[PDB]
Structures are given as structure tokens and as C-alpha cells.
Write a protein that binds this DNA or RNA. Structure first.
Lengths: 144, 77, 67, 191, 182
RNA sequence: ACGAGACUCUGGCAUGCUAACUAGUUACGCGACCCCGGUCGGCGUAACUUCUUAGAGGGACAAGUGGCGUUCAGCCACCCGAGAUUGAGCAAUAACAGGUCUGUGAUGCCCUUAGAUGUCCGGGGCUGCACGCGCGCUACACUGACUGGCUCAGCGUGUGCCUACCCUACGCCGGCAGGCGCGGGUAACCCGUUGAACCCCAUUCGUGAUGGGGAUCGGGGAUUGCAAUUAUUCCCCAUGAACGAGGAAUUCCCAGUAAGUGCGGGUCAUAAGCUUGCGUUGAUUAAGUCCCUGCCCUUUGUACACACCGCCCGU
């Protein structure tokens, strides 16, 4: 119960990143890049794990259950508007992407914008503010 | 000017549990903050342990609030 | 120092003008209860009136002016 | 049937103000005894009308500072109530007697004012008013509890409780006693 | 872990000391005595210099070591008063010489205790009492009873073996003293 | 004679006067529920102005008392009393090379006037970025963040002239931003008893740049409009930077005041980090001074008078 159980794992290696077991399970997997605070609640709600438990004392069955839920969102009654990548420009399907995939997709998106030589790609290549805000006063630490 | 970086444990081990069971009911003023300061434990663990001893009948409740709870020891006689 | 001066409790009798650079303090004519004959003038800081008792740590000093 | 006015659950009688110079600046006995430290106000209109305010109401009024707490009187009332409960549960004494003793022992009796031109450093020691002693005591205890309860797991309702406990004995482990003794030493250094 | 330098918990009056300033204040400042286990002192604005000042940060310089003389010590409430205005340059040389030799002795013995792996304030107090405070009280020299002790015991083992502290820890401390003070 | 004062508006009160189905109160009857009474902003009609609304009047004048003062102009405190200093509006002579020719079919002179400095359309710029400064918004957390429940206002505005563009109850669809049928209000009638926020109660969090903070950046979906890329605005999911109470210096204020907190109006097809008002919670300090920065009167000195930001001597 309140006494620490046997083989309480201190760290986790979910998707090749260190995840501590001291944080809450609704918030320890937030440190996985691509999954935030709101996305972590739905994954742990479709799967039958209570959110009052800690991260390092859950077992491998429910760990791999929520891991396959995170790599396969849509086949577990998760709606299509809950996804960080909807209607992708290459394959055209709704797919939630994770950390290294997120960096790869952002890198190839910026490469595509620079290749097509749009204004957004040119501003991203120059390293300035691209969303269209005033740069006369704010943004002083860009260079020395 | 000592830093002394804090590491507050989340789950009770063997020794902190029975030192709590031998020292916390012998305290004049019992508060989750002060027992977390004395035993170097996390705040939610302190609240859970004091709720457990409140259910066990070794802790007398005085006042209950959303900001803090105040607990006191029982009489020896 | 080698002197443990006993503290004196003294009662004001009148309020004189307000001295100081910015008028922060005022002068009072204060008298003691253990000897109700000795009366000295003291510079007191704060809101005072006629009737309040002041705790004097020493009783042998006379009130200096603003400078 | 108001025999005595219970301050929540505490009696207002059998309390002693030891300092004779503060007999009419501590309004706790038999006239200014209310059930709650919340009143309508109208004490800061005249020149000496704030001396008739009760000391626990003045403590709740001076408790709320630092921008994000201005106007929140009810929260200061419940923190003061929990602090009084903790003081009674710890020392086994009446919380009004601890608060009154914390006022007397934390009040400075001699202060040095700055004299000279704008830029030079020169002090001159003067004695203080009985009202200003009470005001400095309340301000020092409140800012000591506020500084003690900052970036810490310890709540302010027991930080204020330990503030009044240490000030009532003069143990010099509190902020208010230390600042009082600092002011006394600076005043005594150049009399 | 840190331990105090000398057996006196508070310094005597009119004693020189190397002080690091912690923070500037309004009426005074807050400082820390290095050779008395980092207790909070106070330096005054009127105790800075006899002449006029045009910059308070020109001579205070929070984050820098300063030599001050003790003025008033109250052991009952832990109140320390310091004065930089009365400090003469004649004793200043002896001041940082004593401070450097005391801090090198403290560093060597702290390294020896860290090798011995004892983390307790009472344990450091007991071992440092067995090592340095005993011969300091024997020779009757505050600060001067340690550097000369290690200088005379680097080449003589019989002088170092007179202390009945331990055997293995004593040999480790003797080797650490002979390795450094050569 | 002007200025001040006097005057005008508003706030604070009168169980007395005048009247309220576009505002209510109290009795009576019907109706619903609970265990003989209680609740109903459910329904309706016998008096009334206690709430609300707004008109005439009343009330405060240093009036009474005690001290200080030539016992004159006045000052201090107290009793009875809703008030014994509410807040604003208006505001004299003399001038400033103060700002406005970009408010004007107010205007002298000068320039241009058909390849126009008039006018109109299309595109762009007014946002552009090694840097500096000013007014501001959000934070640095546990007097706190998140998640539910409970509960309380006042100023306003609202279907437009050539002028097209109003505020919205109710029912359905969709997580949300939103979309479609139906009705009301030219307004104490409808939105609306304006179920506002801050607060209060109860979980989760535990001193960790952390569930603080939300900058930067990617994808998708709606609305306005002829047109949004240099992202109009909003919504959803990711990304999670600096920032640990701020150096020299400096601004504003003393009573329902500062501060915290939200709501209206102005710009508005789309629209507030600005301004102007409104209400809620609600303090610490002070009834003084001329030290700093300045102001009013008198005396004195002056080689200054576009007036000390003056004048003026020598190598």
C-alpha cells in the first residue's frame, strides 16, 4: 500500500528517453515530446488505469497497452481533431506523431518551404520572426 | 550559505514508516507541512499517512480546511 | 560601558513645537512617576498626545535641537 | 445572552498587558471585544482614532500586503484564526495573551533618525511614541511571517504562529526581535 | 561538510578577521565570518570610513573579502558588531597570513575527513579536536599552533604520534600533511 | 469692478407630502411538494408606497456648551445629530514667435494646373531591424495553479439619412470556435431578476525552471469581407524560451483613497494590451515640515532687461 512495492523502477526508457517514476503517470509521460498534458489524459482514460497512481510502480502490460495506444490513436475511439498532425501534406491521413518523428517532420517541412522559396521559408532560413509581428523593438537577443 | 539540495521521497520505505508510527502520534502539533519537513518526505505522502492514521484512530482531528488541516495527539491517560 | 542603567517610565505634561529637518519629531515636557518633581524636555518621534507614558532608557540627557 | 464576548472560542478577559505605557493602545479588555476581527471601519478618519481599534483587527489589516493580497480580508481572517488555533494547541495558552506579549517584547523603544543634508550619513537617537511602538511591532511581526512563508512548504498560518511564539519569549530566533534589537543597537551606538 | 576554525564559538573584542560580505542593507549590511563557521555579522554605514563617501558600492563590494575588527560580541543572542574604520594596515599582513594558514590546515583536515568518509558536525568537531585543538591549547597559540605543528611534524613522526587520536586515520592525516606541506 | 467666495451638477436622509399594470410591497384565493406548518422570480385580483422611480419642499448655520484669542475677526474639543472639510463644473489682467493651414465651402501670400502637387483605379508601403528610449500587459508562485460546487452589482448600449452595418431569449446539430428555423425590443415593456469577476467550500499538486510562466514555432477547422500571403479574428492539438523580487535612478497617492478584480462607451464589416466611465473586495502610514524641487508677499543688493540658459576679464 503506502509502503514502496518490490522492483519499483526508478527510470523508464519509453521511446529511448529517460522517464522518471516519481512523477504522476498523468504527467510523467508529458515529458515525452509530442504528448502533452491534455493528450495524456485521453490515453489513460481509454485504457483502464486510474490516474491517482505513480509512474514507476505500474506493470509492463498496461505500459505496453498505453504505448500501443499512443502509436495508434485513431483505432481506440480517439476523435480526429485531437491530433497534432491532421491532413498531412504528403500522405494525407490523420496520424499523431511522436518525438523524433516530430523533429523529422518539422525539419522536412522547413526544407520543403525553403525548396519552394515561399516567404515563410525565406524568413525561417534567415532566422527572423515569421508569424508577422513587429521586430523594431522586441527580439533583441537574436544576435550580438 | 549551504545549498543542501532537497530530494523528497514519494513512497515510504521500511524505516521511515515505523519512525513515523513511533514519533508522529507523540507530537504536540501535527501538520502535513511540518511532518514533511521533519521526515524529508513529499507533501502528498504526508497527507496520505496522516489520513491513514486518522482512519486508524491514533490522530485526533481539530480543524479541516482546503488550505491546511490541523492535528493533535491523544491523551496519555 | 559597565553600566546597567535602570529604565525610566515618564509621563508627558505638554507638547512643544515640532523640530527636525522635515518635522518628523516633536518636543515634549515630560515628567517622572518615581519622582514627580523632576521634569526634562525630550525629542520624541511618532504620534504623541498629552497623557501617554514614554519609556526612557536614560534619564540624564537633555533635548538637542534639529541640528 | 452575552455574558462575555467569546472571540470565536477564546475568552477576552483574564489577559494582562504588562507594559504600563501601552494600557490604552491595546484594545482587548471589556470594551473592544468582538466575535470577529472584521468591522465596518471608519478608524483612519481622525488623528488618533486608530488607537481604539482592536489589536487582532489591526493585525488582519496589516497582514495583507504585496500587491496580490490587497483587499482580501476574509483570507487574512481565516489565517489569523488558524494561527490562533495552532498557538493554543501548541503552547496550551490563550492566543490573545501570546499576541499581546508578542506586541510588547517586539516593540522598539529608541530610534535613530537621519539628520544632515541629502547624501550624508548621520543619525541622532530619539525615543518613540507608544502608538508607533505598536505599529512597528505589528508591521515587524507581519513582514517576518510573510518573509518566513515564501518559497517554502510551510504554510503562513503556522509561520505566523511560530512568529508570535518566538517573539513572546525574546529568543532572538524571530525576525521581529532581531530587527528590534538592531534598531536599538543603532540608536544606542550614537546617542 | 563545514566545521569551525577555532574552539572559541565567537571572537573576542578588538580581533581582526577576514570577512566576506553577503548582502548590503539599509541601516547596515549582512556579512559572514569565514573562520567562525559562517555566522551572520553586521557592518555599519558609519563604520566604513572617517572621510566623506560618494559611492557606497565603491568600498563595500558585496562578493569580495574584507578585513574588519570586532567591536561588540553578545554570546547570549548571537549579535556580532564589526568595524572597518578602526582597521590599521599594520596587522593586516598578519591577518591574511593567519587566515591562509588556518584555511590550508582546515582544507587538509577536511580532505582527510572526506577520505575517511565521516559526514557529521559532531564527528568533524571530535576529529578536529583530536587533531588540532589539543595541540593548539597545549602550545597556547590561536592559529599559530597548526602551521608550525605540521612544519615540525612533516620531518618528525614522533612529534605527530604524540596525539592519541587513532592509528589508520592518524597515518592518513600524517601522509596528507606530508604530501601538501613539503 | 474683476478673480476668490457667491453660483450649477452629483453623493449622503425624510416610515412626512405628491403619484405609479413600462416599478413593487403586504393581505386573500387557486395550484405544486414535504412532515399540523414551511417553500414557490408558479397563477390571479383588495389596500399601500416599506423597496424602486422623480418633482416641490426641509435639513447644517460654526447653531449649543467649555477653553485660547485686544475677549474683534477666528481656532480647538464635545453633546444631539444621516452629514460639523463629498467629488467635480465654471474660472481675472498681461503675454508665449507654444500646437493646429492635415477639422472646415475660415483664410492672406507663394507654387502647380492636363505628360497635374487636382481626381480615379490596380499593386505596394505606413509593420520593414546590428541598436536606444517612453507609456503599458503578463509573470517570477503554495496569501498559489488546476478541477467541481455555491453565490453577489452598477453605469451604459441596442434595428441607423443618401447608409448596406443592431442587442439577443428559446429549439436542433457539432468537443469548441460556429451553422439553420423561430420569436421580442424603437425600449423601467425584450435581451435582463444584466445568475460578472475577485472571493467562499472541497480534491489534485509539494519547493523541482515544477501541474509556475506561455514567448517562439507546426498542422487542421470556422466567421467577417470583393480580397487576409507580410499569418485579420477565433477555436483544437503539439512545441515549453527568458524569467528565482530586479543596479544607478525615478512616478503616483492619504478614505471607501491606493491596490486587486471584472463590466460598459469610444473607435468597430471584422476589434482592445489604449482611453473614458461603472460597480465589487478593501488596507498600512500622516493631521507635519521647508531639508530637496517649486510657489505667494515684504525688505535688501545688482555692472542683468530677447531679462542668470544673463553679463563679463585675461594668456
Amino acid at each position: 500500500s503506502l509502503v514502496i512495492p518490490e522492483k519499483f523502477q526508478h527510470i523508464l526508457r519509453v521511446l529511448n528517453t529517460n522517464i522518471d517514476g516519481r512523477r504522476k503517470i498523468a504527467f510523467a509521460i508529458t515529458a515525452i515530446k509530442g504528448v502533452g498534458r491534455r493528450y495524456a489524459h485521453v490515453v489513460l482514460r481509454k485504457a483502464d488505469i486510474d490516474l491517482t497512481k505513480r509512474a514507476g510502480e505500474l506493470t509492463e502490460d498496461e505500459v505496453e497497452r498505453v504505448i500501443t495506444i499512443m502509436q495508434n490513436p485513431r483505432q481506440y475511439k480517439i476523435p480526429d481533431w485531437f491530433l497534432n498532425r491532421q491532413k498531412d501534406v504528403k500522405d494525407g491521413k490523420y496520424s499523431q506523431v511522436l518525438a523524433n518523428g516530430l523533429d523529422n517532420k518539422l525539419r522536412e517541412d522547413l526544407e520543403r518551404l525553403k525548396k519552394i522559396r515561399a516567404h515563410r521559408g525565406l524568413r525561417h532560413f534567415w532566422g527572423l520572426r515569421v508569424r508577422g509581428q513587429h521586430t523594431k523593438t522586441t527580439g533583441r537577443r537574436g544576435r550580438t | 550559505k549551504v545549498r543542501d539540495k532537497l530530494n523528497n521521497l514519494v513512497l515510504f520505505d521500511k524505516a521511515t514508516y515505523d519512525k513515523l508510527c513511533k514519533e508522529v502520534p507523540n507530537y504536540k502539533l501535527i501538520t502535513p507541512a511540518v511532518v514533511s519537513e521533519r521526515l524529508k518526505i513529499r507533501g502528498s505522502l504526508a497527507r496520505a499517512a496522516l489520513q491513514e492514521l486518522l482512519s486508524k484512530g491514533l490522530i485526533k482531528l481539530v480543524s479541516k480546511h482546503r488550505a491546511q488541516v490541523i492535528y493533535t495527539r491523544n491523551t496519555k491517560g | 560601558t559597565s553600566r546597567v542603567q535602570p529604565i525610566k517610565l515618564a509621563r508627558v505634561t505638554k507638547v512643544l513645537g515640532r523640530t527636525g529637518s522635515q518635522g518628523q519629531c516633536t518636543q515634549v515636557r515630560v515628567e517622572f512617576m518615581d519622582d514627580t518633581s523632576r521634569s526634562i524636555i525630550r525629542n520624541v518621534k511618532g504620534p504623541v498626545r498629552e497623557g501617554d507614558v514614554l519609556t526612557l532608557l536614560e534619564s540624564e540627557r537633555e533635548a538637542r535641537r534639529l541640528r | 445572552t452575552p455574558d462575555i464576548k467569546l472571540f470565536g472560542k477564546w475568552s477576552t478577559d483574564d489577559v494582562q498587558i504588562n507594559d504600563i505605557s501601552l494600557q490604552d493602545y491595546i484594545a482587548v479588555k471589556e470594551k473592544y471585544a468582538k466575535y470577529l476581527p472584521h468591522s465596518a471601519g471608519r478608524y483612519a478618519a481622525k488623528r488618533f482614532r486608530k488607537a481604539q481599534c482592536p489589536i487582532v483587527e489591526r493585525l488582519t489589516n496589516s497582514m495583507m500586503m504585496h500587491g496580490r493580497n490587497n483587499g482580501k480580508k476574509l483570507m487574512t481572517v481565516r489565517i489569523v484564526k488558524h494561527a490562533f488555533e495552532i498557538i493554543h494547541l501548541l503552547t496550551g495558552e490563550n492566543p490573545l495573551q501570546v499576541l499581546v506579549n508578542a506586541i510588547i517584547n517586539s516593540g522598539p523603544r529608541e530610534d535613530s533618525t537621519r539628520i544632515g543634508r541629502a547624501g550624508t550619513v548621520r543619525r541622532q537617537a530619539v525615543d518613540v511614541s507608544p502608538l508607533r511602538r505598536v505599529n512597528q511591532a505589528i508591521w515587524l511581526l507581519c513582514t517576518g511571517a510573510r518573509e518566513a512563508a515564501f518559497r517554502n512548504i510551510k504554510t503562513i498560518a503556522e509561520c505566523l504562529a511560530d512568529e508570535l511564539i518566538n517573539a513572546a519569549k525574546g529568543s532572538s530566533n524571530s525576525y521581529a526581535i532581531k530587527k528590534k534589537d538592531e534598531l536599538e543597537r543603532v540608536a544606542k551606538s550614537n546617542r | 561538510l563545514s566545521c569551525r576554525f577555532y574552539q572559541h564559538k565567537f571572537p573576542e573584542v578588538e580581533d581582526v578577521v577576514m570577512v566576506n560580505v553577503r548582502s548590503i542593507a539599509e541601516m547596515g549590511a549582512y556579512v559572514s565570518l569565514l573562520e567562525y563557521n559562517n555566522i551572520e555579522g553586521m557592518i555599519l554605514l558609519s563604520e566604513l570610513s572617517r572621510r566623506r563617501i560618494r559611492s557606497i558600492n565603491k568600498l563595500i563590494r558585496i562578493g569580495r573579502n574584507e578585513c574588519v575588527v570586532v567591536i561588540r560580541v553578545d554570546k547570549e543572542k548571537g549579535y556580532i558588531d564589526l568595524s572597518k574604520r578602526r582597521v590599521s594596515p599594520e596587522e593586516a599582513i598578519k591577518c591574511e597570513d593567519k587566515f591562509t594558514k588556518s584555511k590550508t590546515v582546515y582544507s587538509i583536515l577536511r580532505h582527510v575527513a572526506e577520505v575517511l568518509e565521516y559526514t557529521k558536525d559532531e564527528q568533524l568537531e571530535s576529529l578536529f579536536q583530536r587533531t588540532a585543538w589539543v595541540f593548539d591549547d597545549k602550545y597556547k597559540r590561536p592559529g599559530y599552533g597548526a602551521y608550525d605543528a605540521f612544519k615540525h611534524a612533516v620531518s618528525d613522526p614522533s612529534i605527530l604520534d604524540s596525539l592519541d587520536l587513532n592509528e589508520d586515520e592518524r597515518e592518513v592525516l600524517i601522509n596528507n600533511i606530508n604530501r601538501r606541506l613539503t
